[PDB]
Write a protein that binds this ligand. Sequence first.
Ligand SMILES: [Fe+2]
Ligand SMILES: [Fe+2]
Ligand SMILES: [Fe+2]
Ligand SMILES: [Fe+2]
Lengths: 174, 174
Amino acid sequence: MLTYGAPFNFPRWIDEHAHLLKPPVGNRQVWQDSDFIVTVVGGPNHRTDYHDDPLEEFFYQLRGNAYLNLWVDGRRERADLKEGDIFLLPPHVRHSPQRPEAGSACLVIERQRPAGMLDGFEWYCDACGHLVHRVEVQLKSPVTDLPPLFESFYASEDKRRCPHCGQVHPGRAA
Amino acid sequence: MLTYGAPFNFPRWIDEHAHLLKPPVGNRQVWQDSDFIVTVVGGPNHRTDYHDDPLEEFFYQLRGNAYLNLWVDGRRERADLKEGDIFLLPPHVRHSPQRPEAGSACLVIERQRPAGMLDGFEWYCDACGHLVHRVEVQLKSPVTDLPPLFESFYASEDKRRCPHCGQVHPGRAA
Ligand SMILES: [Fe+2]
Ligand SMILES: [Fe+2]
Ligand SMILES: [Fe+2]
Ligand SMILES: [Fe+2]
């Protein structure tokens, strides 16, 4: 009844999955079907989407450095994840992880969302900072649910169009 | 609205709390009032109680070695937490952590239990393996709720008395 198997060496697991912790995959979930969602996120990767997680998110930047673009108290801000840092993000704080370094690795821990508790993915205008587009999602399989979501934003000049100042958001890369 | 503060260096935090990660305290919670309960557990420590956590528990043995005495599929068993190992324990698997080494440190992550979801603490007979005593608890503050619980077991020859074979459990140390 050890449903998720025996203990195992983490650094070797990370080493062994180096090829997955780089584009295009980027990340790898450690156990499947668990309530705790346990993921290692490599790099490099940059993104323009901001995440609205209705639950907490735990980070431990095991290797290399990264940072989180955030919206804290109405202002754009940056939290660094230097190698060795840990950090706990409160529910709903908008965050956009940037991971510039190859070979970096970050332990990220989350919980499954109950039915009816949704995640938000959002984009903001570089020009005036207004919200450009939000999609909410019952997030069961990030790996497969999120790329079509992001993909549809990039493809729609409409979705990318700031309702405040008309600036068309750049889409994929800032 | 970074309610749990900024990122910070984890190894230095652990170093700085060395005096707390040894008897009598043994462990230190990283953030307070979070949904994710994030704890570093040092040593040495041995115990005879088995935990029935109604939710999952995540371990990452950062420094030194430890092990978990378990009841898996009706049998007494041992899962080692060698330095570097990670491990995810499924809900309700009975476990009794033993941490023989000084200077060891283990990241343990849990979730707050909703109202009405209780933890069990249990003891088993060395002689016949039958359940000797179980207390259930709405666990809000392990640090302060658990010592009086354990304490009351040790003090009662009655509670320590195996209902199957009459052997009085040794209590504090095996
Ligand atoms: Fe996220
Ligand atoms: Fe705008
Ligand atoms: Fe436990
Ligand atoms: Fe017995």
